């Protein structure tokens, strides 16, 4: 249901792990554990990905990543989104692609994509949080219009910021 992937770069070494969880509450408990660790041990850089089933959750997950970095005094240095569609009608899949990437380029975003069999993957970078929220809306919209399943991954990468900026 909900998948959260964490990369912690503690320079010279590197740690990756993933939990799958079913509620927002279990999600929060993973993030709390990670905040405690960061507060107490630090890191050169941290990357967090959360995979939603809907645009409402994606919106919520982006707001949750924001509080996480705020609390840590981390600067949001990097954000992206991966939409994954899956379908049997190739033609429907290719229509979803055509429109998904038009919209993203319309908001000055850069896209990357791969189509393989039933699975279709689109990564969007270089746009502010506000846009990724819209493009999630659009993605869910398109998934419904073409009757294809959909995944939404929001990804944030940050590092510890200035004392002055946190204040």
Author numbering: 3 to 169
From the primary publication:
Here, we explore the viability of such a mechanism by inserting one de novo designed alpha beta protein into another such that the two beta sheets are combined into one. The backbone geometry at the junctions between the original domains is regularized, and the sequence at the newly formed interface is optimized to stabilize the single integrated domain structure. Crystal structures of two such proteins demonstrate that complex beta sheet structures can be designed with considerable accuracy using this approach and provide a proof-of-concept for the hypothesis that complex beta topologies in natural proteins may have evolved from simpler beta sheet structures in a similar manner. Our success in designing larger beta sheet domains by recombining smaller independently folded beta sheet proteins suggests a similar mechanism could have played a role in the evolution of naturally occurring complex beta sheet proteins.
A first extended sheet protein was created by inserting a designed ferredoxin domain into a beta turn of the designed TOP7 protein to create a half-barrel structure, with the two sheets fused into a single seven strand sheet flanked by four helices. The CD spectra show both alpha and beta structures. The structure shows excellent agreement with the design model, particularly in low B-factor regions, with C-alpha RMSD ranging from 1.76 to 1.85 Å among the four protomers in the crystal. The most similar SCOP domains had weak TM-align scores (0.54 and 0.51), and the sheets in these matched structures have different connectivities than those of the designs, suggesting that the two designed proteins have novel folds. The beta strand connectivity is quite different in the designs than in these closest structural matches.
